[PDB]
Amino acid sequence: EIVLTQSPDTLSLSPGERATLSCRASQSVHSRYFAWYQHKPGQPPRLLIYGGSTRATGIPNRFSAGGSGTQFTLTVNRLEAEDFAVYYCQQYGRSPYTFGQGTKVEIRRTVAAPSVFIFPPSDEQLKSGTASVVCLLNNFYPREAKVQWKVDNALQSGNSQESVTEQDSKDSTYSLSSTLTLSKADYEKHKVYACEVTHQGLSSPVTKSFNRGE
C-alpha cells in the first residue's frame, strides 16, 4: 500500500509569498493519478488539483502542480488569506487510495513572547482526590515553544499533555496549555512546582513556579 509523506511539515509565509509543497510516494505513481486538497478547520476539504496538474473547477491559475515517479509538488504562486490551511496530497495510482499526512501553511507575523502563568491544583479538585497543575502560554508567535515541568527540580516526563488553539483570526498568535497530572498522594509528597518556557520572544527561558501551600 502506497504511503505518501509530505514535507516540510509546516511553512510560515505571508500573503504574496510563494508556497511549495512536496509529497514523496513510497512507490512510483504515474504523473496523472494524483490530486491535492486544501482543508481549513471547520470546513469541508476542497479539491485543488486532479490528474497530477489539472486545476479543479473554480481554482485560479495561481495554484499549479505536477511531478511523477516518487515526488509530486503543489505550488501556490502568491498566497492570499484563504490559502492558510492544511494541504494534503492523494494518490489514485493504486488501491487503496491514500492521503499524505498534511503540510500546514500558517501566517507569519512579528515575534510575540508568551505571557506565562502557572496555576496550582485547586482546593476543590484536591478534596475530590485528583491533582492537575496547569501552565498557560498566552498569545505568542511563532508556534515553536518548549515547556518543561519540574517538581522539586526533578524534570518530569510522560505525565503532561499540551493543548493549543488555532492561530488567532485577528492577531495570528497561538495560546497553549500544558497540564501536569499527578496523584494527590504524589502532589502532597513534593514542594516546588515549576513550568519552564523557552521561546524566540524571550531573551532566555522563563520559569513560573509555586511552593505547595504558599
Partner: protein, 229 residues
C-alpha cells in the same frame, strides 16, 4: 444548489453498528462515483471507501475492509456507509464525497458519464461518529486561581466529562475579550478534559468577580464557579 448532506452520526459502543447516509442534490447523481473519507481527532484525512456510478466497483481502506460496506440508491440519490463491528479507532468525522463523472479504461479510452472514485470535487460538511465504552458523565469544574505581559490570568478546568461537547462562558457571557477555551483532550480514563482561561488587569482583581458558566447538555449539567485570587 449542488449539495451533499450527511446524517446518521452519533455515539455507539465498541462492537456496535451504525449507518451513514448522504443525500445528493443539484446534479446528475447517477453519473458520479462517491466515496467516504474520515478524519480522526488530531489526525489527517483517511480514505475509507468508494464506489463507481453503478455500484459495480466498490473498494475499501485496509483498516475497514470487511467491517464497512458502501452502497447507493440511484433512484433516491443516496449513498450509504454501513459500519459494523466498530472500534475506538473508528472515532472520527466522516465525510461523504462526490467522485468523478468519467473513467478511463486500460486502453486509455475515456468514458463520459461513467463516474468513479479517484478523487473528490464536492464534500459534505461531515458527521461525527464516536465509538467508546465510556458512560455519559458531567464535568467537575475547578477554578484556576490568579503577572506576565502586563496582566493576570485565571480560568476553569473542566475535567472528566463524556461525551463532548461542553460550552464555557465568563461572567454570564458578556466577557469574550481575551478568553481562550482549549481543545478537549481525551484522557487515559476515556473521559475528556479542557481548560478555559482569560487574561485580566491585575488592579481589577479585587474590584470585580469572575465566574465561568459551564454547560454540558449531554448530561444536562450546568455549573458556575467563582475564581478567587
Amino acid at each position: 444548489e449542488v449539495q451533499l448532506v450527511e446524517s446518521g452520526g452519533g455515539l455507539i459502543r465498541p462492537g456496535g453498528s451504525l449507518r451513514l447516509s448522504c443525500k445528493g442534490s443539484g446534479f446528475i447523481f447517477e453519473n458520479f462515483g462517491f466515496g467516504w473519507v474520515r478524519q480522526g481527532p488530531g489526525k489527517g484525512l483517511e480514505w475509507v471507501s468508494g464506489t463507481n456510478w453503478n455500484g459495480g466497483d466498490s473498494r475499501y481502506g485496509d483498516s475497514v475492509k470487511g467491517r464497512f460496506t458502501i452502497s447507493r440508491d440511484n433512484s433516491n440519490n443516496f449513498v450509504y456507509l454501513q459500519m459494523n463491528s466498530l472500534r475506538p479507532e473508528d472515532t472520527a468525522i466522516y465525510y461523504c464525497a462526490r467522485g468523478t463523472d468519467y473513467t478511463i479504461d486500460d486502453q486509455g479510452i475515456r468514458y463520459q458519464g461513467s463516474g468513479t472514485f479517484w478523487y473528490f470535487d464536492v464534500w459534505g460538511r461531515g458527521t461525527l461518529v464516536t465509538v467508546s465504552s465510556a458512560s455519559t458523565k458531567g464535568p467537575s469544574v475547578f477554578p484556576l486561581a490568579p503577572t506576565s505581559g502586563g496582566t493576570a490570568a485565571l480560568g476553569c478546568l473542566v475535567k472528566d466529562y463524556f461525551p463532548e461537547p461542553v460550552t464555557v462562558s465568563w461572567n454570564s457571557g458578556a466577557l469574550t475579550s481575551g478568553v481562550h477555551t482549549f481543545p478537549a483532550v481525551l484522557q487515559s480514563s476515556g473521559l475528556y478534559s479542557l481548560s478555559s482561561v482569560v487574561t485580566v488587569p491585575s488592579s481589577s482583581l479585587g474590584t470585580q468577580t469572575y465566574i465561568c458558566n459551564v454547560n454540558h447538555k449531554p448530561s444536562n449539567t450546568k455549573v458556575d464557579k467563582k475564581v478567587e485570587p
